[PDB]
């Protein structure tokens, strides 16, 4: 029974860490969207400029 209990003890603290970490990561991707629109604008501009 002690063996069963021990696995769960270590989990209880560390899982709270991942829970936070995952949501923290999701925030970073929001900011990545801002980059994506920047990437697009440049590409379009370069293409027209190439045509010119």
């Amino acid at each position: 029974r002690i063996d069963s209990v021990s696995q769960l003890q270590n989990v209880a603290e560390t899982t709270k860490v991942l829970f936070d970490v995952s949501k923290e990561t999701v925030e970073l991707e929001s900011e990545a969207f801002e980059l994506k629109q920047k990437v697009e604008l440049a590409h379009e501009a370069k293409a027209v400029l190439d045509s010119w």
């Binding site: 936070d20 949501k23 923290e24 925030e27 929001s30 969207f33 801002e34 920047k38 697009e40």
Partner: peptide
């Protein structure tokens, strides 16, 4: 400013953290 700033994880992250924290401490 092609696309403006976003922090949208600040209301959902804190709420999530409360439920998670409560459960985490209980289990522990």
């Amino acid at each position: 400013p092609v696309k403006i700033d976003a922090s949208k994880q600040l209301q959902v992250i804190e709420s999530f953290e409360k439920h998670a924290m409560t459960n985490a401490k209980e289990t522990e």
